[PDB]
């Protein structure tokens, strides 16, 4: 099965109207190190909820 007519650039854009990405609503701030981080994830320096959970 294949198209009988070439779809338009307009129809291509309409299909892609649901493809846009969503930015992260907001980042969280660690209460001890002050780092920003994804909520419920550890920070880049290894803090979570104010505690040094892992080295490096």
């Amino acid at each position: 099965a294949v198209q009988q007519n070439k779809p338009t650039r307009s129809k291509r854009g309409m299909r892609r109207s649901h493809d846009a990405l969503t930015a992260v609503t907001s980042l969280s701030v660690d209460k001890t190190s002050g780092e920003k981080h994804l909520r419920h994830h550890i920070t880049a320096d290894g803090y979570y909820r104010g505690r040094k959970v892992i080295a490096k």
């Binding site: 994830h41 550890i42 979570y48 892992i54």
Partner: protein, 118 residues
């Protein structure tokens, strides 16, 4: 449908799954913290924490059960000589999972899992 069913298939067959978690349980007992995918970490809790519960009562029969389930005498010894006593007064929840972003190679969601008194 999977109504009320438990356990993750993890795109493996049953013998692969069993062997994988036997190895991963050994790594967690040996190193006390490991990094893995978030779903594997959640499944590992149901393997490792009953091994620690078993190790609270030291007997020949229990050491043999633990050996049957880990196949590693260094792991069995650490379970009964160290972890059992460390957790003797804790009622479950010997591990904690900490989410840590996404793997570079395949964007897999990753997590650390560690013993709670590490």
């Amino acid at each position: 449908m999977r109504h009320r069913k438990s356990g993750r298939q993890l795109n493996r067959n049953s013998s692969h799954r069993q062997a994988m978690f036997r190895n991963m349980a050994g790594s967690l007992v040996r190193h006390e913290i490991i990094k893995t995918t978030l779903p594997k970490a959640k499944e590992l809790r149901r393997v490792v924490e009953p091994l620690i519960t078993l190790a609270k009562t030291d007997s020949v029969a229990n050491r043999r059960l633990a050996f049957a389930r880990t196949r590693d005498n260094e792991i069995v010894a650490k379970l009964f000589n160290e972890l059992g006593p460390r957790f003797a007064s804790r009622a479950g929840g010997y591990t904690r999972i900490l989410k840590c972003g996404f793997r570079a190679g395949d964007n897999a969601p990753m997590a650390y899992i560690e013993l709670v008194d590490r």
